[PDB]
């Protein structure tokens, strides 16, 4: 597909809830018309956006001309959070180039809803446990209770259990691999005998 004029973003797959970061919104032109844009994005409660180059309005970008701006943004919620950024051409402001007709389709404006990841603020860290309960003809039970809310932030507390027998993760290779001829001295001979 294509678009002679749109806006592209530049932002990671993920951020952290804690620290701030610029979101850089780049706008590109290829059709011969050279037109200013009102590129922007609604500030929605799952974050905080702040531009740096609004008051100086853009001038124009022409065919194979592109501009870019910033938003010193920081998230507030956690998870995938849409970034709906909207931009459109303009008319009768012929200050940058010769003319600015600016009559594209009903879809003349590229409004782009995009969900990016965040992790909760701060140095994360883990915690681990385990067990075994093998009644070979009867019953067993057990409990495990789990609390570390000293000096944390909410609900990044999360965990996940496991259920299995753990015996075959290496069973194939070493077994079939390791059968060999006897040769060598008594030392080598035992070395290759005994494993078998």
């Amino acid at each position: 597909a294509f678009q002679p004029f749109f806006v592209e973003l530049t932002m990671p797959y993920s951020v952290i809830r804690g620290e701030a970061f610029t979101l850089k919104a780049t706008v590109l032109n290829y059709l011969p018309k050279c037109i200013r844009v009102s590129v922007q994005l609604e500030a929605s409660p799952a974050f905080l956006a702040v531009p740096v180059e609004k008051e100086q309005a853009p001038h124009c970008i022409c065919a194979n001309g592109r501009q870019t701006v910033s938003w010193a943004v920081t998230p507030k919620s956690l998870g995938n959070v849409n970034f709906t950024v909207s931009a459109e051409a303009l008319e009768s402001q012929e200050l940058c180039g010769t003319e600015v007709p600016s009559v594209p389709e009903h879809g003349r404006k590229d409004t782009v809803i995009k969900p990016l990841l965040v992790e909760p603020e701060g140095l994360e860290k883990e915690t681990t446990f385990n067990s075994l309960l093998c009644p070979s003809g009867g019953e067993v039970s057990e409990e495990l209770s789990l609390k570390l809310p000293p000096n944390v932030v909410e609900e990044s507390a999360r965990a996940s259990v496991s259920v299995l027998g753990d015996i075959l993760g290496s069973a194939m290779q070493n077994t079939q691999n390791l059968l060999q001829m006897p040769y060598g001295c008594g030392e080598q001979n035992m070395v290759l005998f005994a494993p078998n």
Binding site: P120, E121, G122, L123, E124, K125, E126, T127, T128, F129, L146, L148, P150, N151, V152, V153, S156, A157, R158, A159, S160
Partner: peptide, 17 residues
């Protein structure tokens, strides 16, 4: 499990200014 820590440990000793 996992979780997040270090919201503390910003104290004010003398520290020679």
């Amino acid at each position: 499990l996992k979780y997040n820590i270090l919201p503390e440990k910003e104290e004010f000793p003398f520290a020679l200014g």
